[PDB]
Structure formats: C-alpha cells, structure tokens
Write a structure and sequence with these properties.
- It is classed as isomerase.
- The entry lists the keywords Isomerase, Temperature.
- It forms a tetrameric assembly.
- Four copies of one chain form a homotetramer.
- By secondary structure, chain A is of the alpha/beta class.
- Chain A starts with 9 loop residues before the first strand and ends with a helix.
- In chain A, helix 10 crosses helix 11 (295-321).
- Helices cover 47% and strands 9% of the residues of chain A.
- Chain A has helices at residues 14-17, 35-45, 54-57, 64-81, 108-128, 150-171, 195-202, 217-221, 227-236, 264-276, 295-321, 323-331, 334-337, 346-351, 361-366, 371-382, and strands at residues 10-13, 49-53, 84-89, 132-135, 141-142, 176-179, 189-190, 211-213, 244-245, 283-285.
- The first copy, chain A, contains 16 helices and ten strands.
- The B-C interface holds B 21-29, 93-96, 98-100, 138-139, 143-144, 147, 183-186, 188-189, 222, 249, 251-255, 257, 261, 290-292 and C 21-29, 93-96, 98-100, 138-139, 143-144, 147, 183-186, 188-189, 222, 249, 251-255, 257, 261, 290-292.
- The complex binds magnesium ion (8 copies).
- Residues 216, 218-219, 254, 256, 286 of chain A line the site of one magnesium ion.
- Residues 216, 218-219, 254, 256, 286 of chain D line the site of one magnesium ion.
C-alpha cells in the first residue's frame, strides 16, 4: 500500500526531520537529533539518501580533529544502511557574521570568508559522493532600498559563482551547482527571487553548463506563481538539476509543510510533469515537521511525504493512460500545440492567404476549447472517482 | 513648478487616457476618444509621444482603404504637434479568436493568424518611426493544468519570436522587441510571469540581441516582488529596452494607477535607479484613469503621472548629492560592495589565511550595518524634511 | 455515480452559466442566454433552483409592461420545471450611475436611487418565494484615501440597511438579508472586506436578527484567509444564512472557478464543516465558466460543481465515520477542546494549585499533538486511498 | 526639527528595542538589554512610556523573591525617568507548553494554566498603572484542518475572555482588554485573523464594553487589507482602545519595520485619521530593529518611528487646512457623504418620484467624482510640494 523503496530516490535533509521547532516566537519543542540516528530512521522508512549543510554535520567552530570524527561516524552510518548522499550545501545564513549576506555582503572580508567556507564543504561533498551542490542565498538581499546596490551585488554574486566554477574544474570534480530561489524571508527581499531570475542569472556566468536550479514548491508559491509552470520552463531550458518538495498554503511565511499538503492540485500536476518528462534526479523533501509534534509525529510526517508522492504518481499515471483522457486531450487540441506553427517557413507564411486574408476569424473564435471537461476528468482521477 | 517638457521623454499609450472605464462588473463611464484629440491634449500637457496597439488606431476589420485614412489622420496630428511614436504593439487579446492565446494558442491556424497580424503592424510601426516593438502575451496561459503543455507552449513562443526576428532582419528594419511580463489576469496563470522568466527565455532565442524586456511596475508587484530589484537585474543584463510606469496597491487585480500612487517608496527607489543608471528610453505610462473620473479627471490623472516622476527625480537627486548621505553610504560599506571580492584570484584566496583560518568571525559579526540611519535619511529626503 | 437531485439543494445564479465571457481585456465569447433556457438546462442537470439580480431577469430601463412579460415567462419556466428561487439580489454595480457606489455613493441622490431600486426588487423576490436577499456592495469603496470618509460611509451603509429592515418588517415579509463580503475588485478596496467585518457591522444595525452573511469561497481567499475557519465563526454566531461556492487559486483577481477547483483541501474541509454542522440552506454556486468554453463546456462546468460537492461529501463522511480517525481525534485531544476550561468557576480556578503552582509545565510541553498522523488520514480519505 | 516630547504619547514595547535578532534561520546578533537601560534610553529619546509581556520583565520560572526584585528595579527606573506603563500583555507563545495555543489549546490543563498565568500579570499591570491589557493569541490556530474544531475553539476563547472579565470586575480593577489580531504566523492560520473578526467576536462576550481591539499596521496588511479602513471601522464601533504602529511591505512574513517604512501612503492616511478622529490613546510602536543593526542602529530606528509620525502629522494637518483641498473635498461631494440619505424617512422616500420614477440616471452618471485631482493634492502635501 504505497510503500517507498530506495529505488524511488526519496531523500531528506538532515535539517528537516532534525528541526527542533524554534520559530521567531517560540523555543524549541524537540531535542536535537544525532545525524546518525536520523540516517538509521530514514533508511527504515524507505528513504534513498540524505543531504546536509556543512553546519548540520560538523558543529560550527569544530577543530579539524573533531571534524574528522564527525565525518567518520556519519560515513559508518551510511555504510551500515546503504544510504546515499546525492546533494550537499553550505550554511551561509545562521551565524551572525552572515547577517547582511555571504556572497553579497557589503563587507569584502565576509564575502571572502563565505567563499572559503563553501569551498571547504565542496571538498567534503565530493568525498561523500554528492553529485549536486545547492546554494540558497537566504541572506543575500535587503530590507531597505539604499542598503544594497543590486547591480553591484549581482556582480559580486557572479564573481562568487564563477570562482566556485573555476575551483571545481581545476580540481577535476564531477559536481554541478544548483541555485535555490526564494523571494523573501529572512530578508525583506532576496536576490534572484524566483526560478526565472535564477535561470536568467545563470546565462551570464562564465561556464553556464555547470549551473542549474533547485526550485522549491513553497518558495515559488510565496510569490503566487504556478510551480509546475516554473518547473516546465526549467526543464525546457535543461536546467532542472534538483528539486525541493514540500507544501505551502499561499502567500505567507515559508511553511515547509510535508509534500502533498498545501496546494494539492499543484502537487498532482507537478508529479504528472516530473514523471512524464522523465526527471531522474532525487525527489528531495525540504520540509519541517510542525513543532506541535513529538518524535513519533516527525517520522509520520516524513513517511507522509513519500506516501503522497506515490499516491499522486499512481493517479497521474492513470490519468494519462485513460483512453477517455487521451480523447479529451485531442478534443482540446493539445496535439496541435505540439506541432510547429510554421515549419513551412516565413515566406510561405507570408504568402499563405488562409493565415490572414481568407482566415475565418469568427469560425475559429466559436470553437470551444473543451478545457473544463478535461479538467474534471483530471479531478475525477485525482479523487479516485475513476 | 515641476512642469514637463518633451525633453523629459514622457509617453502615453492611446489606450490609457482612452480607457472608457469598462471593467469586469460595469459598463463604460466615458465616451471613446478620437486618437487625434488624445495626441493634441497630451502634447499640450508636455508629453513627448504616444504609443498604440494596432487595434487602438485602426478599428478591427477595417478595409485597406479605411486603414490608410486612419493612419493619415494620425500622421497629420503628429506633424501638427511634434509628437513622436517611440513604441508600438499588437492587440492579441481582445478579439474572441485569441481566447486561448495568440502565439501559444492550441489551434495552429490561430497561431499563424497571430503572427500575420503582428507582422502587419511591425511594418506600420517602422513607418511611424517606432524603435521598440512590445509584446504582452496576455492570453498566453491557462486556467487549468491539463489545458497547456508548457514545454510545447514555450517551443511555440520561441518559434513565434524567432520568426519575428527573422522578419525584421530580412527587411533590414532598425527595431527591437521587448517582452512585457505579467503573472496573471486575464489568464489564471500567464506564461513568462515575471521579468526573470522573460530574461531567461530571451537567452534561448536564435538572435537574443534583438530582444529585451518591458517591465511594468504593477505587474511585478502582483507577484509581491521588488520592482527596483527586478529593473536592476534587467539593467545588469543590458536588457531594459522600455518600461511601463504606473502604480499598484499590492497583490490583487492589475490596478494601473497613475504613477506615484501605490507603493510610493518603491517609486522613489525606481526613479533613483533609472536616473543613476542613465536609462535613456521613454518614460512610458501604462495607466488607467479610474472610471469614477470624467474627462477633466483623465487629464489631471495623466498630468499627475509626469508631475510625480519629476518630484521624485528631484528628491532622489538631492538624496544622492547630500554629503551626509555620501558619508552614510560609506558607513554602510556600499563602497566595499562595488569592489571585487577576489581580484587576486582563486589561488591567492585559497592561500589567504585572513580569509578563513585567522578570520575573526566574532569581530566581523559585531559590526553594525548602519542601514536604518541610511534609510531614515532617504525618508527625510523623500518627504522634504531635508 | 455522484448524480445530483433537487433534494441536494444545488442552486445557480442566472449570471453564472449566463456569463458571456467579457473580461477587462476581451470581448464576449458566448451569446446571451435566455433566462428561460437556463432554467430548463439547469433543471435537467439536477439543480434545485436559480437566483437572480433584478437586471439579469428584467433588462435595465424596461417599462412596467415589458417587466410584467419578463416575469411571466420566467414564472412559467419555474412551473414547468419545478425549479425554486431561494435567493435574489440587486445589481448596484453595472450601470455607470453606480461608479462610486450605491448605498455609500458620495452623491445623495444616487444613494436614494439605489434604495428605491433595491426595494422594488425585494417585492419581486418575495413574490417569487425567495427566503434570502443578498447584498454585495461591489462598488462601495475607494481607490484613494481621501475619496471616502469611511466612518461617514459606514453611517450611510447602516442607514441603508436599517431602512431596508424597516421596509420588510412594515410589509410583513418573511425574508432575511445576507451581506456578501469581498476585499477588493472592482474597487481598490471594498467596504466590509471579509466575513469578520460584515459580522461586526451587523451587530450595529437596529434589527440585527434580520441580517446574516453570504460568504464566498474565493473572496475570503483573495485576502489569504482560511475559508472554513471564517464559515465556522459565522456558524458560531448563528449568521450563516447563505453561501457562495466556487474556486480560487490564491491571492489575485476574483476567478470564480467551478467549485472543487482552486484549493481542493479547503473545499474538503468546507464540505466536512457544512455537513457536520447541519447547514440546511442552499448550496449556491457563484462561478463563471471560463471564456475558453463553448456552451457544451458551460454545462459541463456547472455539472462539475455539483459532482465535486457530492464526491467531497462522500469522502468527508467516510473520514468522520472511520474508527481509526475517531481514535486519532482522541489522540489529538479534540474531545478535550470541546470540554469547558473552567466549569468549576473562577474561584475554584484561582484556588486550583494544579493549574499553576504545581502544574508540570515540562511534562505538558513534551506531549505531542499527533496532528500530522491525523492530517495524513484525512489526506488518505480525500484521495480514496482508504 | 520634529522632536518628540512625552506629551506626544509615544510608547515602545520592551521586546521591540530589546529584540536580539534571532529569526527562523539565524542566531541573535545583539546581546540582551536590561529592561532598566531600555527605559532610560527611551526616556532620553522623548518616549512617553513602555509596555511589557510578563516574561519580558520577569524571566520565566522566577521565584516570588526574584520576581519582587525585578519589579522593584523596574519601578525605580520608572520613578527616575518619569516613564509610564500604559499597557501590558501576557506571553502565551514562547514556552513549548503553548505550542498548540493558550486559551484554545486542545489540552484542558494547558488552558487552565494559560488563564492563571494571565491573571497573575493583570494584577501586576494594575499595580504599575496600566490602563489597557492586550491579548495577542499568536498560538491560537492550526496548520491543518482536523487539528482544531473552530466552533469549539471559539467557545473556549469566549470562556477565557469572559473569565478574565469576571476577574477584573470582581476585583474592581479599572482596566480594559484589547484583542490584537494577526492572520497567520507562527500558526498556519490564527483565530480572529483580522480587526473585523475580532470586533465580531467581542459582541458575543458577556461584558462587551470591557473589550476593544489593538490593531497592528503590518498584521492587516499581511491579509492585503486597507489598514486605515479597518481603523475607521474600529473607531466607528467605539472599539479602538490601543494601536500598534509599524511598517510592512505587502503580503509576506511579519516584518515589524519601523513606522513610516513599508506602505508610506497608508501611514499618511492613518495619521490623518487618528488625528482627525481625536484618538487619545498611546501611539505604540511594535517594531523590530533589523538584525543588521548594532545598538546605535536600534536607537536610530526607534527615533525614526517617532520622527516619521510627527512629519506625517504635520503633512496631514497642512492637507486638511489647505483651502484648495477644502474646495476639492466639496467638488468630490465628501460633504454630501456626511449627510443622511433619507432623514425624511422611509415613506417619504417611497413617495419621492425624484428618487426613482423621475431620476435622471444619465445625468447623474456623467458627473465626474474629481477623485484624482483630490488625490494629487494629497500627494503634493505628503511630498512637501505644497
Ligand atoms: Mg522553504
Ligand atoms: Mg529548500
Ligand atoms: Mg497593468
Ligand atoms: Mg503594460
Ligand atoms: Mg467572486
Ligand atoms: Mg458571490
Ligand atoms: Mg507584527
Ligand atoms: Mg503587535
């Protein structure tokens, strides 16, 4: 009954099930989890692997000696469980030194420190076998207009990512970068606030082939945007390197609900798209078990993430395989959308009198699109009424 | 007292002061304006020029004979007033044939018709001396998930813009295209919903140098985004070809208030940015005089657009020239943001022990950014308290 | 298979399936429907009844003679089909005279005209057997701060509703009023913008027992509010006289999607609440078939409204009847929420040392709420995985 | 130059300038402030008084002995400075025991504990001379639909407030309660989410005269609502007992910016309303100095709160005193809005043929409202261009 296996490629951040429940108005409600027990519990639930910030695994300020001991304990748990580490990232947001950003801090010495902290963790990520390195610039931004010249900040952001790209190519590392956008919180406005802004920025880097996006369901929805549409544009550009799955109820603070919560129909269309397009990367959950929950609720919440993906996967597959849906797709002319507008070329189009001079505009306008019948078949499939 | 002259490059769409006041719930409250009287009245107000949709100037369905007479009347009014036409665009949204889009309609024959309708108006725009041709894909989108395969739609959108680019280069026209993003309305979700999505899409076109963005204040604010930040990224990419100025009160329907209304502080930071960066294109107002107004209120509203720009221009210039503000900018290290993070290169950075091993993280964290004092000086300048 | 019957009390506005598809940017895509054919088609679909604005049934400006003929045709169709008319309302928003409002227009003569137009339709509504009279003040509001003194406007709004209440009591009519809130559109801000504001206003009227609320799914969601929570407060106050069912995708223009579209999980919790609380009024759909659709799509969209309600009704009933869910409700202490905090009284509470002096705050804090397991059971029931 | 004095009645929460800068993603950037030094520094800035949560003044878990010493130190600083304490409140949100709420927690023993914790602080507030006791139910709410039966929760909320009202009347205390609404954060949805919901709830309490609202600028704007409109309705109902002043940039997390930041024009219309209506309560700032700031930035931010109020007060007064504005108000018929619609009564209205039968609807519709000229005069006054 919708049981995950490591072949489903479900992954979790250490910081997700490990979130102690401290929010802007309240103290932690759960004790800290040992990264080793998180790996063990996730493996029993059917997870494929885990991800980490440097500071999740190695407490900030650790000596090189303690650092080695933390990695060895972690590596032993991975060996014992068969869990993989497909992605890693840097914490450039918790420590007070990053209060005005890491890569785009106004202070130059902070920017240099941020780069050195990142490079150190890239080495560790490669050693653990990570294939994607995520950058979430949570402190890159501003609360007021004069605090940040955004053109200069984008220069600094490009400089930082270009240097990271020079570092991985000079070391011969087989790792790629993924930028994770977020529109706001904790800064009043964050630089590169949506998937689109991040995709546009990547095209200005020196080695654009090394960089893609790591979109998160809830973050695009914090701007009221259609997440499946944004994912489709990232896939269209060949830039969907990784994805963060969770839930969000509209435009408000970043909720990080378990996947399937929040906008359920958007979750259906997302799974339909990822499975149809053959996305083969990790299905990563960046979620927070609500601070109302004890540790039993943490693992129930994590299990629910994977369960909801598998239920939606089944429903989307039944939707696409239904002959009546295939009939409805043709009635709405989805087949015609996939055909070129003018494969005959510009000159043939200009000479084609049926495209303008003799085009019956009233007859074309009278054709219904039959979209509502199609959408109700999708609803019926989602709800199990077909 | 803040009087505009044609040297200020203020322009208005015919459809702005010409809006009759029909909204989704109500009939028109004003009679239609002759395009010739709009040109005359705007010239008396100090405007530099006007813009038009094809269907604003030539009523849909006009014969070639009536078309010639409409253009000649319009050209005579331009000659009589000295008004310019710096931009033109196509109406691909009003007629029922465009109910599922123009360039990305599911029906192939509609897509071909949309291209022919656009090409015809490009010829006219060039004849009138327009330098920028704007495309607002208001019907390109969907209300439901299955109605539009977004990857196929982006293929169709790229095909359409590539064909337009082939057309202007083969004709030898000196005109460039600007895509105007909008996140929603009238479609449930519109393709290329923000400046970022449009910038990313442009980089996939065959001749990207021909295409830029035409951002609108209110449209980015309909996604809760920081409009000056988005403009800065467009300037950083070299893609700000045109701009639509107006006002918007938050995330809701597209209000198109007169410029300066809505988010007043964002308007200040926008003008500061455009003037500092030396933007030399038209200051175009895409606004709607509220349907509460008679024709006297229409011209008062249009005059207010230009007045508010000139007041904000004065205040932003006083802000940047104030020695105390220049002192505060250095106190907040805006000068350091403009300096390279690592002009010494990657290897020097890796060997620099002051960037990590010997970096005093507690001393750097204790430095205040002094952003609040800087922002209050900006407030004082905006309010005329300095 | 989820077939509606008139016993389900599904009703539709004439203006819903009759919407011609004119939006702020486009002309109508469908021809006008005769109110008589709408009644016939809805009856065949299983609807219980219809609702109307005065101007939906009797074209504005009609003579008393034409008025009588329009009512007689309509009454004959009701007799032929068995359809009821449970609710009626006034159009105080389409005609230009209402551009600054009806009851709160700045012009006194418009306010008097608005009252007379309303009173005339109350008489007709009573004659047709309507039990609820809805008031949606779509033009009561402002785009700018100085245009409307809101305290004076609330005086005028109270005066108007008090006069309507005096009229129905003096005539001996058995009809009640329901105020329909909306936060914005077509005005920049609308007075009484949410269910809460309307409930508070009602308590200041001379005869508060005559007035309740007519909340609409999409309107509360245009403020990002939880619609089932707002309905619960209206039920708690005894003021849910009527309800408008539809769908909305977040904070944007009023979409009026078919019910079940938009926020699907909120639709589930709404149906669960209405059915558990024993709401016995009409299930009214205020929706607009998208303008992409021809007339076949209109009736498919209307049928989908009722189908989705019946599917959700089945799923919510299975959720509440599931013994495992009843167990989970007790594990989350929903039973304790229903028990008085201090039925022993204030003095016993003050003397109860187990409530403070000897309360084990750490042991209470450690109890998990088990909310995530409960919410996943709700998800499983909604998706038909149980 | 816009200097505050204690006669301006500016007050600050201890938790405002005392905020250490811990946010959901980052550690504190400032050390804790002694409440005594906050009182001294605020007095030097011209503040009138301070407010506190119980846990701001007396650390949680303090013995009665330490409690007495904390109050005595605080009282001495008030005596030394002349600072007043006009308002106090309870922290029912930080400690883990309150993770599912205080007054509406599902666990009955937590609800009883919450009441006892509140009653203890009411005694202290009265001893310090507070006139208003604020309740912000930050944890009263839910992240999921089944976790909270909202009708039962409203019963529990009414029970709690009724008991507090019985307590203050039985003790003979001269204190009133003010409910502070917030739509979300830290809960997914918070009960009584707006001013309207809180006003409606108050009317169901046993002694409604004891309860009013404490609206906060940013909280109503988190629902996209017009804050001056909501304040006007609270004033109209006689329920504006207190107010929280700050700034917010649209629909997102609760920013608590200094007053005047965020929506500047809404701040102008708010001050215009408070001063015109003769609001005589405290001008309380509930704001957070951004965590980018050191302690010098904290006091600059607090000073900016008061400065911006005084500048806006001057501009609103000049606006209302300008003869040209008074002329424009009559041109827009604000005088007619203040006059009764039908002081002649219902029967005279029904017999008045000029209100309907002979009303010239086309002539009334043609009248412009002149709102745009009025709004530009307001803009000119705000910007100091008049
Ligand atoms: Mg998130
Ligand atoms: Mg993430
Ligand atoms: Mg617009
Ligand atoms: Mg525009
Ligand atoms: Mg609606
Ligand atoms: Mg409605
Ligand atoms: Mg706040
Ligand atoms: Mg507050």
């Amino acid at each position: 009954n919708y049981q995950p296996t490591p072949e489903d490629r479900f992954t979790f951040g250490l910081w997700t099930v490990g979130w102690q429940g401290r929010d802007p108005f309240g103290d932690a409600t759960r004790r800290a989890l040992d990264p080793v027990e998180s790996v063990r519990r996730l493996a029993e639930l059917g997870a494929h692997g885990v991800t980490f910030h440097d500071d999740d695994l190695i407490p900030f300020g650790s000596s090189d000696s303690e650092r080695e001991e933390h990695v060895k304990r972690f590596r032993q748990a991975l060996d014992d469980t068969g869990m993989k580490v497909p992605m890693a990232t840097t914490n450039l947001f918790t420590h007070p030194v990053f209060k005005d950003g890491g890569f785009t801090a106004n202070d130059r010495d902070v920017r240099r420190y941020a780069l050195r902290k990142t490079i150190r963790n890239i080495d560790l990520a490669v050693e653990l076998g990570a294939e994607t390195y995520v950058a979430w610039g949570g402190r890159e931004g501003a609360e007021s207009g004069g605090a940040k010249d955004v053109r200069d900040a984008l220069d600094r952001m490009k400089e930082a990512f270009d240097l990271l790209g020079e570092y991985v190519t000079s070391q011969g590392y087989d790792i790629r970068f993924a930028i994770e956008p977020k529109p706001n919180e904790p800064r009043g406005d964050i630089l590169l606030p949506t998937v689109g802004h991040a995709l546009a920025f990547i095209e200005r880097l020196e080695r654009p082939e090394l960089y893609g996006v790591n979109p998160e369901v809830g973050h695009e929805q914090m701007a009221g945007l259609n997440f499946p549409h944004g994912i489709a544009q990232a896939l269209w550009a060949g830039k969907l390197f990784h994805i963060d799955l969770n839930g969000q109820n509209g435009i408000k603070y970043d909720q990080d609900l378990r996947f399937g919560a929040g906008d359920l129909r958007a979750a259906f269309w997302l799974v339909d798209l990822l499975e149809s397009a053959g996305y083969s990367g990790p299905r990563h959950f960046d979620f927070k078990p609500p601070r109302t929950e004890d540790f039993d609720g943490v693992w129930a919440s994590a299990a629910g993430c994977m369960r909801n993906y598998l239920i939606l996967k089944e429903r989307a597959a039944a939707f696409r395989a239904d002959p009546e849906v295939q009939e409805a797709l043709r009635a709405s002319r989805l087949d015609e959308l996939a055909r070129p507008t003018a494969a005959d070329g510009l000159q043939a189009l200009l000479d084609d009198r049926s495209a303008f001079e003799e085009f019956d505009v009233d007859a074309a306008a009278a054709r219904g699109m039959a979209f509502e019948r199609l959408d109700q078949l999708a609803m019926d499939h989602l709800l199990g009424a077909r």
